[PDB]
Structures are given as C-alpha cells and as structure tokens.
Amino acid sequence: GKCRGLRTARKLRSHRRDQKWHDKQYKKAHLGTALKANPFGGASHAKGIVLEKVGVEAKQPNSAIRKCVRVQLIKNGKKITAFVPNDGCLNFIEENDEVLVAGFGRKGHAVGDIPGVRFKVVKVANVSLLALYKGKKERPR
Amino acid sequence: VRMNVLADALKSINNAEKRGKRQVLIRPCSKVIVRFLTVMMKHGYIGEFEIIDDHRAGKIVVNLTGRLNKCGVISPRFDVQLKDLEKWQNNLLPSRQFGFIVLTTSAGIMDHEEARRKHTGGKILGFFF
Amino acid sequence: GRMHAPGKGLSQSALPYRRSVPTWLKLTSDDVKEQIYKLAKKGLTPSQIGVILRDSHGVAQVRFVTGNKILRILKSKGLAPDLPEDLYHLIKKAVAVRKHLERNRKDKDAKFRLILIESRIHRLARYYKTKRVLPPNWKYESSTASALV
Amino acid sequence: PLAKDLLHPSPEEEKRKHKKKRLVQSPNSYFMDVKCPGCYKITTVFSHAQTVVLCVGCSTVLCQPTGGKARLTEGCSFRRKQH
RNA sequence: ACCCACUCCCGACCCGGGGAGGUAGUGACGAAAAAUAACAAUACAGGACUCUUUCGAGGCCCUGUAAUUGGAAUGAGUCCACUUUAAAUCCUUUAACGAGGAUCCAUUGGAGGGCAAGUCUGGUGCCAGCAGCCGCGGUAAUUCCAGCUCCAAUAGCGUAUAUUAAAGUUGCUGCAGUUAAAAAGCUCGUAGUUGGAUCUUGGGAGCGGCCGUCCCCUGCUCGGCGCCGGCCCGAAGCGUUUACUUUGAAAAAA
RNA sequence: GUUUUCGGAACUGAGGCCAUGAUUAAGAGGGACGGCCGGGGGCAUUCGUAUUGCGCCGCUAGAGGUGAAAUUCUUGGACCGGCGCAAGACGGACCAGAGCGAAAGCAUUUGCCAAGAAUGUUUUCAUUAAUCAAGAACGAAAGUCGGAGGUUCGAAGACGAUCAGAUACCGUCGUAGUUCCGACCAUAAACGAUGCCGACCGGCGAUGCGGCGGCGUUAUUCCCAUGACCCGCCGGGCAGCUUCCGGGAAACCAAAGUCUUUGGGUUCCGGGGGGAGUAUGGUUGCAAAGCUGAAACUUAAAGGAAUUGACGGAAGGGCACCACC
C-alpha cells in the first residue's frame, strides 16, 4: 500500500475496488458480457441437436482431422462446433440427434490442436458416448 | 516534511548499527524517542545514551553494542487489544524467545511482555530484536 | 525545501544557546521599547525595526532584552499595522507584478510567477483567518488590491 | 572512522562545521566596539551589519553593507566584545 | 403412499380435526462406521546360527509366495419367531439353512514429464487417435488401438462448470512502476490524506532477599467509631471535551 | 396595612490580591533586509558577417550539379573579381557533461521593466506545513483561422537521374509552410524512459554561485580596498570517478540502497500477448484531432537482462604464390 494513514480506509478500499477491474478473471465474472456471450448461458452442460458432422484440420505442428459436430443448442438456438472424443465415435452420431455437450476443460478456451472448438459431446440420444465406445450400452434405434 | 520523529530516530540508529558505529547522533528529539530508547536500554540492546539540550528540540547521542539486529517504527500507531498482541509478536518479531514490541499504553511506553502482566493494551509504537 | 521553488536552501539565522542578555548592553528594556516606538513612528516594520536595532544599537534580540517581541510591543500600544507586514509585502509584490503585466501580455513567465505569489497570499490569508487577526469577511481580490498599498 | 567522540567535537572540528550542524547551534557573528578617529564615541556595530551605521553627531559613516561581513571604513578599529 | 401414536396447534373441547407434523417409498446431494477373507501343513525363496574357501548339512528361530491341501470362522443373502411400530418396515436379538475358483467373481482412472507406475509384446504409420500444458503419431510409438503387467484412490472413481486455497498473479498484513505492463509534459491548487519539539516529579507508609510488589500526593448539601460552631470519615450532586486501552452490564436459539 | 435582615437569581462601580497572563524560535515554512549571481522572461534599441535579389565596373566561356551524368543558368555576359544598395532569416568561432528556468525553453550590444534561486543574517511572523480528486496557468514541432512579410530552406507538385520498377534515397526548380502579429490546437523517445517532500548510510579530486579564512605574485600604484591567480573550509546546485554500504533478473544505481529484519508522508498509475488506444457514448475543437474508453474474439507465450555461437553491405589486427606484388 502507498497510503499508510490511519484514517485512509476508503482510499485503500476504493482504490482496490477500482483496480480489481484491471484483472481478467474478475472483469470476466463481474460483467454480463462474458456470461451473455457464453453459448451455454453460464451452464455446465447443454443438450443440442446435431445439424452436420464436421472435419476440423488440426493446428500447425501435428496434423490430423478432428471430427467435431455442428450443434443447434435448444435453450438459446445458438451454433456450436463440439468435438467428439475417442477413436471412431463419430460413427455413433446420426444427424438430427439430441447430444448432451460439455466444455473441453479450459473454461471456454480452445484446447490442443482444435481451432475454436471449446466443447466435447458427452451423451448421444441420452446414451453416454463412453458407454457406446466401451460397448456397454447399445444405441437405441 | 518530518512527520514521524520516532521513525527518523530508529531508522538512523538502525542504519548506524548496520554500519558498525560505536555511537550515533539522532538530531531531532522527543519524549517518545527517550522512553523508547530507555526500554531498549533496560533489555540491554543499546548502551547508556545522552540527551544534548539546546533550547530547541534536543539531540540524543546513543552508545551502541552489536546486539540490536533491527529497531523499527510501525506507522501508523495502530490500536492493539490484548487479543491482537499475539498476532503482532507473531508477524513482527523474529521469535517468541526474544524481540520486544514497544507499544504506548496508558500505564506508559513499554514492551509487550509488561503490557501482558499489567493487563493494558494500547498503540504499537515499534519493535526491536 | 522551498514552497514555490525546487531550492533546498539552508540560509537560516541561528540564535545562540544563552538566551541570557550580554553584559555591555546598557539600554534597559524600557529605553529599547521607547526606541522601538521611535522607529515605528518613522514608518518601519517589525522586520526593519529589528535590523536597525541590532546594527546601530548592539541589541541582538528584543525578546532576550525585554520579555516580549517587536510586533507585540507595537501591538500593545497600537503602533502595529491593521494587516500583517508579510501578507502586506506579498500583496505589495502582487500589485507590482500585475502593474508590469498590464502592458506585457507576452511576459508568460511573469504571469506564472503572479499565480505563485497569488497562492502565497491565499495561503497566508487562510492562516490569519484561523487566528482571526484578519476579518472572516476579508478576501484578497486583485481588483480591490491597489487600495491596499 | 567508526568511533567518533560525537559528544566531544574538538574545537578545530566544531568551528569548521556549518553553524546549524554544530552539536549545539552556535552563530559565526559577533558585536564590534567600532571607533572612528575623528569622533570620541565607541558605537556597537553588528559584524554582518547590512545597513549604513552612521556616526551620531556626524564625523563619518562607519560601515558599508556587503554579502556577509560589512566593510569597516579605512581609519576605523574594532574590538570583538563577548560574554 | 400410511398415520394423528409422537411434536405441537385449533375448537364449545380430558373425547373431534390437522398433507402442520410424524412414518414408510424413491434417493451414490452429502456425512459416519465398515465385508470382499483369516489360520496351519507342505513344497520354494530371503534373513538370524554351529560350520564350509565355494558347494552343501540342520532347522530348533523367523518372514514371504503357489487354483497345493486341510478343517475352523462369520455375514451378504434365504428365513420361522420376538422386538420395533398407530399398523408395519429397517436396525438390534435369535431357531434353521447359508462359502474354496470362498464364480457369494471391485471398480474407476492411469503408467513420456509435471505425477505414483513398463523404454514389454501385437496393430497403425503426421492416418486413426491421444494430449488440462509441454508434447506423442510419417516403419526399432515408454504417449494412439489392444494383450499381459504395474500404479493410485477404493465401494467408490472419472468428467464439465461456478467457487476457495495455491494468488505476495489485487498485495491492509504484502506486489509492482530506469530497461519486462507501468510516473500525469510541467507546475499551481480546493476538499481528501499526513503533519515538528514542548506543559510532573520526587519521595512519605509497609514487607522479601542494593533490586523487587502495594496505599497516598482536586473541592463544596445529607449523617456514624467519636468530641467541648467545627475537626477525622460515610452517601449524594458539579467537575476540558473525544479517540484509545481494561473492566462491567446487555446481547434468540441452531 | 407594610418594608426589612434573611435565603436566592440578574445589571453594574472601585480597590487590593494573582510571581498577575505570550514555551521555544525547528539543519520546517513564509516575509523583510544585504551584496552578489545567471544563454531566466518581457519591451525596446543596437550590431555582425553570410545568403538572395538589384545596379554599376572588369575580363572571359563556361558555370551549376553528381559515384557518373542530366534538368537548370549562359556571348541578351552566367559563374568569377570589385564597389554599393535593398529585404528577410539567423546569431558562427568564444560555447563547456558550464549557467538559468516548473517544464516546454533560453546566446550580438545597450537601456528600461518587474521576477528569481543560492549564500549572508544574534531581522520578523510563529506551524503558517507536505502531497494532492475539482479547478487552473504555461506547454517544442507540426497543423488550423484572419492579417503583415516573403531571404533561405522546403511537405505536395513539375521535372532530371538510378532502377527491373523508384510515385524513394541523389540532383534542379518549387506551393503550403518556415518568419512576425492576434486567435486556436494541448500533443513528442514532452526522456533521467526514474512523481514530490523528509531522514539516514562511503571515499575522492574537480567545476558553478555565495560566504568565510590563509603564505605569496600581479593591476588600479601612493598605501588601502577591491578585482585576477594561489591554498583551504562551509552551504546550495549541474555533474564525474571510485568502493563487497546495500540493492537488483541482470545491465547497472550513493540511489533504483536503508524491503520477508517487509509500516516516514502523499499523489498518479500497471496486472500475460494480441483485439486496441479500436468500436461506442460523452466532452473540448472551425478543422485536424485531443481527453475519458470497452467487449466479443484470438493466443502459449510476447517480453527483459545477460552468456555462447553463427552472421554483418561495421571497426582493427594477422596469415597464405590453392592470395597479391
């Protein structure tokens, strides 16, 4: 602190109050703009409907094709490219399927090789994509 | 300008002892400096000093050992209950085995250990070890 | 450090330890006061009185010789000025500068030094109103200032 | 030097130092028994006069003001008086 | 879903009524305890000892592993009865059954580094995919897809998101500002904030072995330890004003 | 039937009594005083070459310009040489790690005008102070509006070269502008990239201002006292060197130290890189623009200091008939 007056409580509090806005992690949480522009509307997960299956070219170094899924969210009507996890799990996603969709892990930031894809597909037609991959549940059709 | 005269004093005899001086002039003088020094003397940290009387504020000349590791002021003079005096000596002294917070009580300017047995809190002036 | 300069000067007057009067000084406190009255009547300030006294009449400090100081000797009898000498001299300087700056609008340095002097005045005015040696109704205005010589 | 007798400055050291910075504050001025040879009376003049000290019953003008110590006019003598 | 039996409430009311409330049902929100084996005989191996250069001998002593074998165990469940309770349930108690692959079968995530644990084998070949980050994948992949193996937590374990610590990366404690982000071009200036020194000390009373712990260093209307109008003292009321510190009152439970 | 003492409260006259009442004068601050000091500021006055133009006189064909040329000027006499005249810029050398100023800034002479730090002080006031939301003054250059002037230089533009191109670097012209006056504008790597005030903690020799002291030499010579040197000290300033004070990531800093042994006062201000000083709203401006100022989104770095290497169309040294002489 740069005012050690005994009667300086408000300058020290009112400075700190003003300088907390220059923090990212604070400015984000304490404005509507981060919580509005969030496609999930501040929710953890979100059910949406697959409208196409999309190949996304991996980043500069490594070079695969990352199989993601273009999603119309129910609650918002908003557009999302959400990644599909492990080997050969895009074979489990028929078009126009209700998929439960979570974040990727970095609180709405793009992960690894996948440019501007912040989401993974968790369940497809209310059946878990780990259970389909392990073959425990069979896809109800 | 000069505002905390006890700050100028304790920083000047701290500077001087770090340099290894046998004595140090502290060239404004207050009654609060003189009480603080007498407390540091009773615990043998500084040597028997001397207050030079001009007809303005005095000058003091303080004989030093090499016992005073650091003296220092707490500015501003925060109010200390007997509750809080553990948390000060917790964060402001180098151990429980030695070092003394000086704090001006109503009873008088004195160490934290006498402020316990007299059972009087007050305003923290400084500290030394 | 000075008020309106970067100057860190140390040209101070340094009184001696012994407040006790010297031996040689034969003038009693009353004849010093009588001579202070004679200087005040001629039209001198407590600053100018004190100088003239210590030079020609070997009286170091009037406070040391008498009990009291020169303005309080002027003030007791009523030879003291209505508004203090130091606030008089700043108002005197401000009227001098402002007169120079009537026909010298180019002189931007003068204009800046005027604002520094104006600030010295307002600053002293504010002090003397706390000590009620000026009226609370008083305020130095530069248009009213030329009447205050 | 670490060890200095701060309480006992040797008078060579004290008179060297700035008047304000002396262990006890002490001026560098003094009063003079200035006498002119034309007149009878000894006037007391301040060393750093800063005025024109005149002969009362004019035989001369004694001192003239400068930066520091005033110039005592050629002809005049001075004793420095003390207590 | 069952019930006014508990808790209380309402009424003219010891008597009626109460989806308030209670009791079950669903319930891995979460919290507590806590099974999934223990013990011996053997093959074996490591470690005490007489002894031997080395081997080897003995096991009186230990300790560990083999779907080796052997009985003794006790509850998951099944289930009469009592108890429980408004009536039941669950729990507790207790006849009888109830275990060798004890199949009465523990998962969840990992095993390049951070980060505990394979440079094993088969597949793929910058593909598929993994990968919080750094990175792995183009023909000896410690990272993908599997097998064996090993590690971690364990009836739980992973994931997404908010949030706390870690963050001394919001800094009052406690950050920074020459060059990493950062000192207004410069000065004046009002509220804000901060503000020099200085105003009581010596001893009286008493104890322990020169030093320690105590009582005292304001004054003027009403009565009790007493006295020949007042002396010593008890109880009111005025007594620079505040912060501060110490004590006291008072401050719902949960 | 009363006015009184008595209690009790207001208005007010004299005396005594109080030891009758004012702490000190900050290595805080203001103000006065003194002799200085400075490219401090303003107004005026004055000078100096030089440049360009003009006139006159002389003699001659080139001159300018460039790495090389060309454009341009030029037998209607350019360039050059001599005497003048006019205008407008600018103040060389002296000129410094020198001074002054709040910063921007400030250099011919002389005068006037107010101003200012520093020192000197046994002068005065006596806490008047430090820093600062609001508000305010000044604020390089460019740029804007209305006048005046237009020497040089020269954004745009016209050419002439170079070039692959060359709307550029080079060259010749050249409008706005550069200059002065009045009004804006308020920004610069406006930099010491270092807020202001205060205290303390090393050494050294310098320099500038004032003061104080000390052998000697020189001038006003006729002593003085003043200048000029000389040798010290003190304060204040711009600096420098040096040191394991200490700090720091280091480079480096007597401050950027006196910080985990963390608290002298106070203002502004930063929070990974971009997006962006952008959009938007307000506000100031004639305009150009300035002040305040996000978000989505994007990203694993961007950056600082130092080390080693490679590299250079940098500097120096060295070798070799696979280099030269």
Side-chain angles (χ1 to χ4, degrees), chain B residues 1-15:
Chain B
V1 294
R2 165 172 286 144
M3 289 171 178
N4 199 337
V5 186
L6 194 267
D8 292 326
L10 297 187
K11 186 160 283 290
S12 180
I13 81 160
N14 181 55
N15 273 321

Side-chain angles (χ1 to χ4, degrees), chain B residues 29-42:
Chain B
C29 176
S30 83
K31 187 170 52 183
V32 183
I33 296 165
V34 169
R35 291 292 175 78
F36 197 109
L37 290 171
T38 51
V39 171
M40 269 198 293
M41 179 193 303
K42 282 296 292 177

Side-chain angles (χ1 to χ4, degrees), chain C residues 35-85:
Chain C
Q35 195 179 147
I36 284 163
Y37 297 144
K38 181 53 65 71
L39 287 169
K41 283 177 173 79
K42 287 162 68 174
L44 267 72
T45 67
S47 305
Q48 286 181 323
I49 287 168
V51 169
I52 297 297
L53 279 178
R54 74 150 151 73
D55 297 348
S56 54
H57 288 88
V59 39
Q61 294 291 110
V62 170
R63 194 180 63 268
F64 286 172
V65 171
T66 79
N68 311 310
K69 57 192 67 177
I70 299 174
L71 182 61
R72 277 170 182 177
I73 289 163
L74 263 67
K75 190 166 182 291
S76 66
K77 190 165 172 59
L79 272 297
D82 57 320
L83 67 97
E85 56 160 315

Side-chain angles (χ1 to χ4, degrees), chain A residues 2-5 11 15 19 22 24 27 33 109 118:
Chain A
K2 203 81 174 305
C3 60
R4 301 199 187 84
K11 190 59 175 283
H15 174 82
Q19 294 298 326
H22 291 112
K24 288 187 78 167
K27 185 72 162 279
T33 58
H109 185 277
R118 290 87 150 283

